[PDB]
DNA sequence: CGCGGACT
């Protein structure tokens, strides 16, 4: 809904998530979780401590479109049940390391053509589509970007009402 | 010997 979608985005930190394949993104939302690299794992634990909400905006590499956005719900931990990610060349399973469990808010895609007017002040005012994995998006640019996705009636806002 | 590495 439009009433409380802005409530979960208030005082939040946004992070662009890149994936060299769409399979792991499909595995991401099918499992409702995600895992990233140690350098980005460090900063995402930093953001979870200081933000009312940490939004991960997913964009498959070389896809020309976003695949939705989700909310970080917990820090990363090791030793859990294994996830069979499609490892990019030169990436081991230990690189994934900690396990991030997220809550998806919108699963509908968004082409880059619809977000060309949005520039990220924290990436030299470049269009928000441009950026590596873990690139933080400024509050306003991230909030306006989340609003341009089509409404996902399959997801309700009552679940993540007060998970904080 | 497996040793790398998720922008547009």
Curated annotation (Swiss-Prot):
The PTM Phosphoserine maps to 81, 92
Substituting residue 68 to I results in: Abolishes RNA-binding and ability to influence alternative splice site selection
- Give, from the UniProt record, the effect of changing residue 85 to D: Does not affect ability to influence alternative splice site selection
Report domain YTH positions: 12-149
The PTM entry states: Tyrosine phosphorylated.
Q: What is the effect of changing residue 56 to E?
A: Does not affect ability to influence alternative splice site selection
Impact noted for substituting residue 37 to T: Reduced binding to N6-methyladenosine (m6A)-containing RNAs
The entry's RNA-binding residues are 18-20, 34-35, 85, 133
Q: What is the effect of changing residue 104 to D?
A: Does not affect ability to influence alternative splice site selection
- Location of this chain's protein in the cell: Nucleus; Nucleus speckle
Name the reported effect of residue 123 to D: Does not affect ability to influence alternative splice site selection
According to the record, mutating residue 34 to D results in: Abolishes RNA-binding and ability to influence alternative splice site selection
The outcome of changing residue 24 to D is:
Abolished binding to N6-methyladenosine (m6A)-containing RNAs
- Comment block on domains: The YTH domain mediates RNA-binding.
Q: What does this protein do?
A: Regulator of alternative splicing that specifically recognizes and binds N6-methyladenosine (m6A)-containing RNAs. M6A is a modification present at internal sites of mRNAs and some non-coding RNAs and plays a role in the efficiency of mRNA splicing, processing and stability. Acts as a key regulator of exon-inclusion or exon-skipping during alternative splicing via interaction with mRNA splicing factors SRSF3 and SRSF10.
Q: How does it assemble?
A: Interacts with SRSF1. Interacts with SRSF2. Interacts with SRSF3. Interacts with SRSF7. Interacts with SRSF10. Interacts with CPSF6. Interacts with KHDRBS1/SAM68. Interacts with TRA2B. Interacts with KHDRBS3. Interacts with EMD. Interacts with RBMX. Interacts with ZCCHC8.
UniProt protein name: YTH domain-containing protein 1
Q: Report the source organism.
A: Homo sapiens (Human)
- Mapped onto the parent protein, the portion here is 345 to 507 of 727
């Amino acid at each position: 809904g439009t009433s409380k979608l802005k409530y979960v985005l208030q005082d939040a930190r946004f992070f662009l998530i890149k994936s060299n394949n769409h399979e792991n993104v499909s595995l991401a939302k099918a499992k409702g979780v995600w895992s990233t690299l140690p350098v980005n794992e460090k900063k995402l634990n930093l953001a979870f401590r200081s933000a009312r909400s940490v939004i991960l905006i997913f964009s498959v590499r070389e896809s020309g479109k976003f695949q939705g956005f989700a909310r970080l719900s917990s820090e990363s931990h090791h030793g859990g049940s294994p996830i069979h990610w499609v490892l990019p060349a030169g990436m081991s399973a230990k690189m994934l390391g900690g396990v991030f469990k997220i809550d998806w808010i919108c699963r509908r895609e968004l082409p880059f053509t619809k977000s060309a007017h949005l520039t990220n002040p924290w990436n030299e005012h470049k269009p928000v589509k441009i950026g590596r994995d873990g690139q933080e998006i400024e509050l306003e640019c991230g909030t306006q970007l989340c609003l341009l996705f089509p409404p996902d009636e399959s997801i309700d806002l009552y679940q993540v009402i007060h998970k904080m």
